Amino acid sequence: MTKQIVVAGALISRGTLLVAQRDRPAELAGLWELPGGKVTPGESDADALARELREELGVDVAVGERLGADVALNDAMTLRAYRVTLRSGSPHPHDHRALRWVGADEIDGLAWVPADRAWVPDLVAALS
Numbered sequence: 001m002t003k004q005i006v007v008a009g010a011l012i013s014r015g016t017l018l019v020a021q022r023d024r025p026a027e028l029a030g031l032w033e034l035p036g037g038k039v040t041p042g043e044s045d046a047d048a049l050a051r052e053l054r055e056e057l058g059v060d061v062a063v064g065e066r067l068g069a070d071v072a073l074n075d076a077m078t079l080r081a082y083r084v085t086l087r088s089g090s091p092h093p094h095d096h097r098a099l100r101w102v103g104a105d106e107i108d109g110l111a112w113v114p115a116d117r118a119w120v121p122d123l124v125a126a127l128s
């Protein structure tokens, strides 16, 4: 068996990180994540992530290098983050409850969705 991929983006602008507050499902609603979503059939990781961020945030990004380690979300799925940079737009929460730009001092204490917490040191490092 092979695992489905979920891609997430670490958008850093002016030394701060975009985080996004989920509105669904109930178990994650109110918690914060790196925005992204499931890769659909035929898509590269970059294609999927750029599409998700265009849909969720209304921005065009360039997809860069991996950020941190892959995370086993559950027995079916693997979550991967990439550094992304803003080419065009201001993020807007189409799907999320809220967005926030956070600096290094606000990464550890943020109410992360459980899976994304694994990336805290990587995110702090990328910001420092």
Ligand SMILES: Cc1c[n+]([C@H]2C[C@H](O)[C@@H](COP(=O)(O)OP(=O)(O)OP(=O)(O)O)O2)c(=O)[nH]c1N
Residues within 6 Å of the ligand: 006, 007, 008, 033, 034, 035, 036, 037, 038, 039, 073, 079, 113, 114, 115, 116
């Ligand atoms: C983007 C993302 C997603 N995560 C989890 C939440 C879900 O259990 C699964 C899929 O993410 P989701 O954002 O729901 O993907 P969608 O593509 O929007 O899901 P569909 O409703 O299936 O389209 O990954 C997660 O833990 N962290 C994170 N940064």
